[PDB]
DNA sequence: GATTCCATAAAGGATTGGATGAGTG
DNA sequence: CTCATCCAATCCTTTATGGAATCCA
């Protein structure tokens, strides 16, 4: 081999999903909703973590634009009004 | 009322996401975490509130994870659908 | 006085709904707790920590 | 067939606070 | 000044089962 075995940097978290069990709690809070297929809460485990990534990002813009470090809920709230695609989050978040 | 537990996923979950997409070194607030957790559990009723709108229409009892797929688009989150059947085909088998 | 996108508009509406019969049966997180868990909370003040507060590993110093 | 319940079991990872430096207000 | 990061050990949750009842193309 070469002078050394040549290294990799670890960056990488071991495979974590958001639990299915709860998201189909948080999926079933509504009266209507009754029967669910196995896999809908397996598209919402992977469809949240694509939510979480833009909505930070789109906010952590706001926080720079203050010239900070730490995201703050204000910082969510700008992101909301901002951008059309979070406008169901009206009720959730300030502004 | 109801459990905390079950309304929300995990704040620890929800901030290792956050966490992903941001600077090495950035810091996140615990109100942004924790109104996080309430954005994304509503983003999932409503999602999942017009899937079963539709499966109202369509006289179809349970709901599909295409419904979601097409509630999605149809609120205008058609850019995640795309990787999402790469994800979800994988699971099909 | 608050505007919003035609694509949820009406999606926004039928959970506006949705989310107002919650209330009358209060099915709403009102408000948070310090702790989720009391048992989880108390092993945690009973936890070995260095004298800068971090959770210690038990397996050093033999 | 789906799906929903109710159990039982195992397994696992989220929960969790003191001290202190980063950084907000 | 407030507060978010940093640790890891339990223990509640999650997942994995096995059944039960119900529904419907």
């Known amino acids: 081999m070469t002078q050394f075995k040549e290294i990799e940097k670890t960056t990488d978290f071991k495979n974590h999903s958001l639990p299915l069990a709860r998201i189909k709690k948080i999926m079933k809070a509504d009266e209507d909703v009754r029967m669910i297929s ?9 469809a949240c973590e694509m939510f979480i990534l833009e909505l930070t990002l789109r906010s952590w813009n ?16 700008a992101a909301v009004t901002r951008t059309d695609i ?3 989050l009206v009720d959730i978040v300030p502004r | 009322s109801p459990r905390e537990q079950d309304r929300f996923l995990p704040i620890a979950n929800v901030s290792r996401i956050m966490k992903k997409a941001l600077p090495a070194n950035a810091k996140i607030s615990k109100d942004a975490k924790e109104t996080m957790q309430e954005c994304v559990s509503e983003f999932i009723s409503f999602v999942t509130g017009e899937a079963s709108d539709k499966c109202q229409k369509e006289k179809r009892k349970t709901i599909n994870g295409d419904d979601l797929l ?5 609120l205008g989150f058609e850019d995640y659908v795309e990787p999402l059947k790469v994800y979800l085909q994988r699971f099909r088998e | 006085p608050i505007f919003v996108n035609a694509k949820q508009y009406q999606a926004i509406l039928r959970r506006r709904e949705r989310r107002a019969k919650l209330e009358a049966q209060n099915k709403l997180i009102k408000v948070r707790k310090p702790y989720l868990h009391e048992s989880r909370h108390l092993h945690a003040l009973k936890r070995v920590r260095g004298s800068g507060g971090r959770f210690l590993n038990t397996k050093k110093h033999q």
Do not use: C, G, S, Y
């Not at chain 1, 196995?38 to 992977?46: I, M, S, T, W």
């Not at chain 1, 926080?63 to 969510?76: G, M, S, V």
């Open chain 1, 86 to 88: 979070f406008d169901f």
């Open chain 2, 70 to 74: 097409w509630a999605m688009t149809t």
């Open chain 1, 38 to 46: 196995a896999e809908a809460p397996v598209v919402f485990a992977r």
């Open chain 1, 62 to 77: 706001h926080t720079e634009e203050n010239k900070r470090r730490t995201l703050q809920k204000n910082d969510i709230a």
